[PDB]
Design a protein around this ligand. Structure first.
Ligand SMILES: *[C@@H]1O[C@H](CO)[C@@H](O[C@@H]2O[C@H](CO)[C@@H](O)[C@H](O)[C@H]2NC(C)=O)[C@H](O)[C@H]1NC(C)=O
Ligand SMILES: *[C@@H]1O[C@H](CO)[C@@H](O)[C@H](O)[C@H]1NC(C)=O
Ligand SMILES: *[C@@H]1O[C@H](CO)[C@@H](O)[C@H](O)[C@H]1NC(C)=O
Ligand SMILES: *[C@@H]1O[C@H](CO)[C@@H](O)[C@H](O)[C@H]1NC(C)=O
Ligand SMILES: *[C@@H]1O[C@H](CO)[C@@H](O)[C@H](O)[C@H]1NC(C)=O
Lengths: 230, 59, 230, 230, 223
């Protein structure tokens, strides 16, 4: 089977929790009984637009099946018992949410672009350093003044294990934008989608005027007979 | 356009504020605060007592 | 049913103590009794001073009795008897002045509109933070250049208790002005009336020029021969 | 039976749309056959932990149907089926998410405390100004450093009509903190839960230093040669 | 079979163009019938480092061959050319570096740890943001004061495709240090090794000092 449980990007981006019952390298023959069940044996909604009769002569069927959030969050192990003519034994899919994972909050720091790259006058890469999440499922989305940017503009690294913490992970998200936008100053917020967050979204923003500190310029006019009056 | 925010003539501090019409967009116009403080180098601590010691700390 | 008391808003703005109970049009009745009876028993006469004009509008009227003496300020068990033959249970309501409430002066803070809000260049919301008043009733009116602004321009909240304080209340007043008025530097004054104030009214004013400055330029002219200020 | 619908604040704190058919306007009687049925023609596991008998012209049996977010916003007209001695018919009230409400996102502005508040050195009130949102269902909670503060520390006003906008609402929520906590510099995030937000959560943040640099331009003029004239 | 290729991360760490063979997922008997060769058959060396049998019934005949860069960058085809007892027919690899790819220099930028992380005081992450390098090789190792940090401390992401440049890539490597270590002023120099660099090593230095701008701008005025 080519199927996957819903990772924490398509459940959150589409707001709806979708399974999969995709198969591969099977024979295009009779008895296409994919048999969407639950742990209780109840039938979930059937497949729509099955990807059968592939050009490489492989059987597949996209498991478009709408379910709730809570039953996938709970202990229900949704079995997809695929039975065919060549395989009368059911190709059961025990796809569910794994348990025992310690929920650790991301500690998202938004790193502004470096001074050398701003001095190159070409692009500004602003980093959403999402670190310390133990379930390695983050969906970072970049929003400009409340409007989410295109996914071609920002790319995110896959969740990689944290160096000095075993259970935690980390990820980045650069948003390569033009430097003439960064000199003007826009909010450039990065929302992160993780399960362990209390509201499931942390938004961090940085523009040009955050790390700029109180810049005193003192003028000790200790002797000036120029006739000026302050 | 220096509006007179205070004109305190007992501590000599004059504070004046203006909106510098710096750029075309109406937001980055800097609210400028002009504190002008005259420090009397030889006035005593109590001005009405001329035998008072010299005022050194000006808070 | 409702019997709205004269608050310090009705006491101070109108200088007229009007006992008012609203009889909604539950059922049409010819002789609607909105008789404002004292604990002594004499009734200061009111009848249909203004129609309620509810969405049903079936013989509904507002009776406002001008018991304007010191008997309300001292206190009495004033009762309007909403007794009706239709729905024969008398749906009366009793209101008295709250007795012995400790009086703390409001600390009135005028918050300028946010830098995030002026970037939209659409509207500016000025917040009058009347907080720290332990008698519940408060009157907040906005003025611009000494003229009372229209009550549709600003909206003030009901007083709710301050969280950390035991019984002291707080109130808001959000004045929604256009951004071109606030960025030109127009003084919006918050006039707030409370019993515990010494002069009974505090006026906070805010505008762009006072605000929070973004460039202090100080000149400590240390002159030997200052002497008198000039 | 007056069934209180699950508000967005109620389904956001619990992450479970628990709609309640609390038995209102029906006194304590026998023949309890309370069941929540979905509009398709079925019913689910319902009413965990109904309360005891309280014959104060009502009852205390509570609906606790744990239907989902994709169930409640699907528009399914859920009906409770309370029967009693006074009426031997299921009181099938129509409860669903109304589709007639416009969906405009909040413009959440987070005004810092006034400088007088820190000057008084006993309290600072950070006010979250949730304004410009069309459905009157906003849940505002505050986090200090990513974990929520207690609901006693902040107070959120009810959503009130924004007067200039036609049907948009506004709501302000203060959090009264100590002056010494704000002077250290903390994030003090205001999380606003609303349906019309793109990710259903926005978050704004004010530190001790949240504005511009406010660059100082001090000039110690330490001679009478450059001393001012009048 | 999987002919493991000499990558620049693998070459620069060992200073030898080392290529290994990976014939796994087979019957786990201990018989060695592999000689590493060239296409001409002249790269003949030892088939060492054969590890123990894997628990899932597979063998780990690996071997190790080392040659210089000149031949690897000359475009010569190399073949492991397995001839084993369980293979009914011999296989071929014809493995070489893909020539013709454009070479763009990495523009590495040392983003300092954010002020939100330094206020937490638990740790500080310094990211060497390697961008724009068109051959998808990088070797981001971190050294402070001339001595290389341990590979457990720093972790480098795989070179991902650049979002806006067509064929360029970016990499991202963080160094977890304690907050008290960053306040001392240690150098934390990020060293990148990529072939498109003119010198093949670039080192940038990130301190507490380089993040701080000119706070005071004192202007002494006389006469
Ligand atoms: C400043 O100096 C004046 C003049 O010496 C002081 O005023 C006198 O104070 C004494 C003692 O308090 C009184 O007996 C006099 O009646 C005051 N004379 C006048 C004209 O006011 C004044 O007290 C001094 N103030 C301070 C703070 O030292
Ligand atoms: C201080 O700074 C302002 C702007 O930052 C500049 O115009 C001014 O000339 C500076 N003072 C001196 C003495 O140069
Ligand atoms: C502040 O700057 C203005 C220039 O806009 C200058 O005229 C004024 O003298 C300065 N204030 C003081 C107190 O020197
Ligand atoms: C402050 O800066 C202004 C320009 O913004 C300049 O004209 C003025 O001289 C400065 N004040 C000093 C140096 O005291
Ligand atoms: C102080 O800084 C400003 C810009 O921040 C610059 O224009 C000015 O020349 C500086 N002062 C001196 C004395 O160079």
């Amino acid at each position: 089977v080519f199927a996957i449980p819903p990772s924490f990007a398509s459940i959150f981006l589409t707001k709806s929790t979708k399974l999969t019952c995709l198969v591969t390298d099977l024979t295009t023959y009779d008895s296409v009984t994919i048999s969407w069940t639950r742990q209780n044996g109840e039938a979930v909604k059937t497949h729509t637009n099955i990807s059968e009769s592939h050009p490489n002569a492989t059987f597949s069927a996209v498991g478009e099946a709408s379910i709730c959030e809570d039953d996938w969050n709970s202990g229900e192990r949704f079995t997809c018992t695929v039975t065919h003519t060549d395989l009368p034994s059911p190709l059961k899919q025990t796809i569910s949410r794994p348990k025992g994972v310690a929920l650790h909050r991301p500690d998202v720091y938004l790193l502004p672009p470096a001074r050398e790259q701003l001095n190159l006058r070409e692009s500004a890469t602003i980093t959403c350093l999402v670190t310390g999440f133990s379930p390695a499922d983050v969906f970072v989305q970049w929003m400009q003044r409340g409007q989410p940017l295109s996914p071609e503009k920002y790319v995110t690294s896959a969740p990689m294990p944290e160096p000095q913490a075993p259970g935690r992970y980390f990820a980045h998200s650069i948003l390569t934008v033009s430097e003439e936008e960064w000199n003007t100053g826009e909010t450039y917020t990065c929302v992160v989608a993780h399960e362990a967050l209390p509201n499931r979204v942390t938004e961090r923003t940085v523009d040009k005027s955050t790390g700029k500190p109180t810049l005193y310029n003192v003028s000790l006019v200790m002797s000036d007979t120029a006739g000026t009056c302050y | 356009e220096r509006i007179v925010l205070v004109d305190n003539k007992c501590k000599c501090a004059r504070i004046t504020s203006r909106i510098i019409r710096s750029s075309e967009d109406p937001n980055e116009d800097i609210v400028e605060r002009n504190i002008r403080i005259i420090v009397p180098l030889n006035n005593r601590e109590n001005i009405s007592d001329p035998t008072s010691p010299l005022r050194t700390r000006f808070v």
